[PDB]
């Protein structure tokens, strides 16, 4: 019998003249946003067919979330459409672990696990199922601060609604119930979290490398899972494995994963065994909008 409360988030519409594109990043540009008369320059990423409707669905979700471990939308620009978000200078975490694989220690790894779980727990409190959690969809602000991104598949659940039933989706990150029945829940995001942790702990290897996506569900039905990464103690691997239980309500909760990884991060070498272990510039996190 729980009802729904209003979503009073504010969608900010930016003027094209207020931002300057500097260089291409991927099209996504790195640039500066300079709102008129405010004496600030904010580093931004500027991401530039009627299916426009997907970028607006994405804008709607990003305007509705506010957490230090979820990506920050500054606004949209309605030219012939641009989505303006906080610049995350070190890019996506998958590429970051692959490129710095010889300089990544146990403290960094465990702290990233904590932060992603905090962001995901926040999304669960907002009743949002992300549906595309992966290392590619975590962005790096600094080595010590990461945030979840890419809300293009995300869905808001009603207050009395446990499942989203879908009508292209990344098979190797998906829970088995999502592959077989198009059912998505916060517990299916937990399966994807487990896969995401596996990508980090292997320094960015591809899951189920060389196995085609059509084979994956039958592999999982037979009881097989991703293998224990060389650096992982049984304590860390057991958490991943629990994320990949068939029974979705047997999987850990994001709030539990925060607790378990924060304990490990207090004694990181017990849990991972690793070889060799401008004046007016304001970051978006210090530019608060009513
Ligand atoms: Na060690």
UniProtKB/Swiss-Prot annotation:
Changing residue 153 to R: Found in a lung cancer sample; somatic mutation; constitutively activated enzyme with strongly increased kinase activity; more sensitive to gefitinib than wild-type. Belongs to the protein kinase superfamily. Tyr protein kinase family. EGF receptor subfamily. It is found in: Cell membrane; Endoplasmic reticulum membrane; Golgi apparatus membrane; Nucleus membrane. Changing residue 16 to G: Found in a lung cancer sample; constitutively activated kinase with higher levels of basal autophosphorylation; more sensitive to gefitinib than wild-type. Changing residue 270 to A: Reduced phosphorylation. The active site is at residue 132. The modification N6-(2-hydroxyisobutyryl)lysine is found at residue 47. It comes from the Eukaryota. Binding of the ligand triggers homo- and/or heterodimerization of the receptor triggering its autophosphorylation. Heterodimer with ERBB2. Forms a complex with CCDC88A/GIV (via SH2-like regions) and GNAI3 which leads to enhanced EGFR signaling and triggering of cell migration; binding to CCDC88A requires autophosphorylation of the EGFR C-terminal region, and ligand stimulation is required for recruitment of GNAI3 to the complex. Interacts with ERRFI1; inhibits dimerization of the kinase domain and autophosphorylation. Part of a complex with ERBB2 and either PIK3C2A or PIK3C2B. Changing residue 64 to I: Found in a lung cancer sample; constitutively activated kinase with higher levels of basal autophosphorylation; more sensitive to gefitinib than wild-type. This is Epidermal growth factor receptor. Ubiquitously expressed. Isoform 2 is also expressed in ovarian cancers. The chain holds residues 696 to 1019 of 1210 of the full protein. The record marks 287 as: Important for interaction with PIK3C2B. Changing residue 85 to M: Found in a lung cancer sample; increased kinase activity. It is linked to Lung cancer: A common malignancy affecting tissues of the lung. The most common form of lung cancer is non-small cell lung cancer (NSCLC) that can be divided into 3 major histologic subtypes: squamous cell carcinoma, adenocarcinoma, and large cell lung cancer. NSCLC is often diagnosed at an advanced stage and has a poor prognosis. Changing residue 36 to K: Found in a lung cancer sample.
């Amino acid at each position: 019998a729980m009802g729904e409360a209003p979503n009073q988030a504010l969608l900010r519409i930016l003027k094209e003249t207020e931002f300057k594109k500097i260089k291409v990043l991927g099209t996504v540009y790195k640039g500066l946003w300079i709102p008129e008369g405010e004496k600030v320059k904010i580093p931004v990423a500027i991401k530039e067919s009627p299916k426009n409707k997907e970028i607006l669905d994405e804008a709607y979700v990003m305007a509705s979330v506010d957490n230090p471990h979820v990506c920050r939308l500054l606004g949209i620009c309605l030219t012939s459409v641009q989505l303006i978000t906080q610049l995350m200078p070190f890019g996506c975490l998958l590429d970051y672990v692959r490129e710095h694989k010889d300089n990544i220690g146990s403290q960094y790894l465990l702290n990233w696990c904590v932060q992603i779980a905090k962001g995901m727990n926040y999304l669960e409190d907002r009743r949002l199922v992300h549906r595309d959690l992966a290392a590619r969809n975590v962005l790096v602000k600094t080595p010590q601060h990461v945030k979840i991104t890419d809300f293009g598949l995300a869905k808001l659940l009603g207050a009395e609604e446990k499942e989203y039933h879908a009508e292209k989706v990344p098979i190797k990150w998906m829970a088995l119930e999502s592959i077989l029945h198009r059912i998505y829940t916060h517990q299916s995001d937990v399966w994807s979290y487990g896969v995401t942790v596996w990508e980090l702990m292997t320094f960015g290897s591809k899951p189920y490398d060389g196995i085609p996506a059509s084979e994956i569900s039958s592999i999982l039905e037979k009881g097989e899972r991703l293998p224990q990464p060389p650096i992982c103690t049984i304590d860390v691997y057991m958490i991943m494995v629990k994320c990949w239980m068939i029974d979705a309500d047997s999987r850990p909760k994001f709030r539990e994963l925060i607790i378990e990884f924060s304990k490990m991060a207090r004694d990181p070498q017990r849990y991972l065994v690793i070889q060799g272990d401008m004046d007016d510039v304001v970051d978006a996190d210090e530019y608060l909008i009513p």
